[PDB]
Design an enzyme around this catalytic site. Structure first.
Site, mmCIF file in Angstrom:
data_model
loop_
_atom_site.group_PDB
_atom_site.id
_atom_site.type_symbol
_atom_site.label_atom_id
_atom_site.label_comp_id
_atom_site.label_asym_id
_atom_site.label_seq_id
_atom_site.Cartn_x
_atom_site.Cartn_y
_atom_site.Cartn_z
ATOM 1 N N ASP A 89 0.695 -1.115 -0.121
ATOM 2 C CA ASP A 89 0.022 0.017 -0.077
ATOM 3 C C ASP A 89 0.869 1.096 0.020
ATOM 4 O O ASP A 89 0.485 2.281 0.639
ATOM 5 C CB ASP A 89 -1.070 -0.154 1.413
ATOM 6 C CG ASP A 89 -2.087 0.860 1.098
ATOM 7 O OD1 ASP A 89 -2.349 1.320 -0.149
ATOM 8 O OD2 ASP A 89 -2.951 1.347 2.047
ATOM 9 N N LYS A 109 2.099 4.719 -1.160
ATOM 10 C CA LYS A 109 1.590 6.139 -1.569
ATOM 11 C C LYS A 109 2.030 7.024 -0.495
ATOM 12 O O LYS A 109 2.140 6.997 0.529
ATOM 13 C CB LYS A 109 0.010 5.879 -1.879
ATOM 14 C CG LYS A 109 -0.962 5.451 -0.463
ATOM 15 C CD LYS A 109 -2.349 5.113 -1.031
ATOM 16 C CE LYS A 109 -3.043 4.899 0.137
ATOM 17 N NZ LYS A 109 -4.680 4.322 -0.131
ATOM 18 N N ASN A 169 0.252 7.558 2.714
ATOM 19 C CA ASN A 169 0.819 6.508 3.876
ATOM 20 C C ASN A 169 2.281 6.600 4.259
ATOM 21 O O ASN A 169 2.777 5.905 4.940
ATOM 22 C CB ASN A 169 0.925 4.897 3.198
ATOM 23 C CG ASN A 169 -0.665 4.270 3.607
ATOM 24 O OD1 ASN A 169 -1.412 5.055 4.076
ATOM 25 N ND2 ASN A 169 -0.699 3.081 2.705
ATOM 26 N N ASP A 200 0.705 2.270 8.324
ATOM 27 C CA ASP A 200 -0.570 1.584 7.775
ATOM 28 C C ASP A 200 0.058 0.201 7.199
ATOM 29 O O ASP A 200 0.195 0.215 6.055
ATOM 30 C CB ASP A 200 -1.517 2.113 6.835
ATOM 31 C CG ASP A 200 -2.922 1.821 6.630
ATOM 32 O OD1 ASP A 200 -3.777 2.609 6.499
ATOM 33 O OD2 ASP A 200 -3.328 0.700 7.124
ATOM 34 N N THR A 231 -3.974 0.316 -3.708
ATOM 35 C CA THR A 231 -4.714 1.653 -4.100
ATOM 36 C C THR A 231 -4.492 1.790 -5.872
ATOM 37 O O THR A 231 -3.574 1.242 -6.533
ATOM 38 C CB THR A 231 -3.963 2.662 -3.631
ATOM 39 O OG1 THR A 231 -4.186 2.780 -2.169
ATOM 40 C CG2 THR A 231 -4.823 4.202 -3.994
#
Lengths: 18, 350
Positions: free
Chosen positions: B168, B170, B173, B186, B203
């Site tokens: 994840d 990005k 985060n 996260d 995502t």
């Protein structure tokens, strides 16, 4: 422009998973 | 050859030294992983300062009554968790956080539970997400982006050595601490897996093509995501975007990317090797592993050790107010602990 296209995408905010 | 004897021997020794660190890191991880820590604080040890966020629970800025130090506390309603089918994700995330140790990973300082809730007490990072700084500044210069990228490269090298896939990546985060360095938060989608895994998760802008195409995939999806991240940091927008996720997936699997004219040739070469649909050609996934990334021309000025040791001067320091200035205040809905223990068996391990 690419930047304008990004703005036009509606996905300039925080993006959720899934 | 590209480097003479002095450079080649120093590089060899540095790479061997990384292996030795990782082997020790894996041993420390496995002990904590096989025997996780539980119940290291209680709710009345903290004062609820401000609700910093609000689906499965809220995140609140709290102040340890004893320490005085502030923390970010994730409160998860055990019944909501169970109702939304998030039992394994929540257990796994806490088990990973309590077992990992790396300077660019947000730290779990306490965890506990009561009759109604699960609590994860994290390091508080007042600078907030890279996301908002990036959107504010517009884009980061290549040296600025590279400083962040180097930390992710190291963090992924650490995590992949533990057979953890992050999945994840990005700017949302990535938190920026008071020294300008990155804290990854996260681990909700992280998974310990040696071979392939199949879960459609992540995502849309950051999904590797092999995830989109319903293939089994491996840790190489994190290296693809690194490529999207570096692109977005240096361009100000991601390489693949559209009105709808479906049209994003089309561009991702097409095997075509276009770059801004201000991208250096070194950067475009790196990104073509990360944003590589062909898994047999994707940097991070080849025989030389992460070394293809660490030795790439775009990272030539990067002192990997100094970055790990946090000796490099950050290019940007968020305004050191801890203030909830960089967070949109919510309605402080109080926390109530039921008289009855809700969902005991499902969360025995928490």
């Amino acid at each position: 422009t690419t930047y304008a296209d990004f703005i036009a995408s509606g996905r300039t905010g925080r993006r959720s998973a899934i | 050859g590209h480097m003479g004897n002095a450079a080649a021997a120093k590089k060899g020794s540095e790479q061997e030294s990384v292996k030795e660190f990782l082997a020790k890191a894996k041993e420390e991880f496995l002990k904590k992983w096989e025997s996780p820590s539980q119940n290291t604080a209680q709710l009345d040890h903290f004062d609820r300062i401000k609700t910093l966020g609000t689906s499965f629970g809220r995140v609140m800025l709290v102040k340890h009554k004893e320490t005085g130090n502030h923390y970010a506390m994730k409160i998860l309603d055990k019944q909501k968790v169970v109702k939304l089918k998030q039992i394994e994700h929540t257990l796994n995330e806490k088990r990973i956080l309590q077992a990992v140790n790396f300077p660019f990973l947000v730290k779990l300082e306490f965890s506990f539970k009561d009759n109604s809730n699960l609590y994860m007490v994290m390091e508080y990072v007042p600078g907030g997400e890279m996301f908002s700084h990036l959107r504010r500044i517009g884009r980061f210069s290549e040296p600025h982006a590279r400083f962040y990228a180097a930390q992710i490269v190291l963090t992924f090298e650490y995590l992949h050595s533990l057979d953890l896939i992050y999945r994840d990546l990005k700017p949302e985060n990535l938190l920026i601490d008071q020294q300008g360095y990155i804290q990854v938060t996260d681990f909700g989608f992280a998974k310990r897996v040696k071979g392939r895994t199949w879960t459609l998760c992540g995502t849309p802008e950051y999904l590797a093509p092999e995830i989109i195409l319903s293939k089994g995939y491996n840790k190489a999806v994190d290296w693809w995501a690194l490529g999207v991240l570096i692109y977005e940091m240096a361009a100000g927008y991601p390489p693949f975007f559209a009105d709808q996720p479906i049209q994003i997936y089309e561009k991702i699997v097409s095997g075509k990317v276009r770059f801004p004219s201000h991208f250096s040739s070194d950067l475009k070469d790196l990104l073509r090797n990360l944003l590589q649909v062909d898994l047999t050609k994707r940097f991070g996934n080849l025989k030389n592993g992460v070394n293809d990334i660490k030795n790439h021309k775009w990272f030539a000025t990067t002192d990997w050790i100094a970055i790990y040791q946090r000796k490099v001067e950050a290019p940007f320091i968020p305004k050191f107010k801890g203030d909830t200035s960089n967070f949109d205040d919510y309605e402080e809905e109080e926390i109530r602990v039921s008289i009855n223990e809700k969902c005991g068996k499902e969360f025995t391990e928490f």
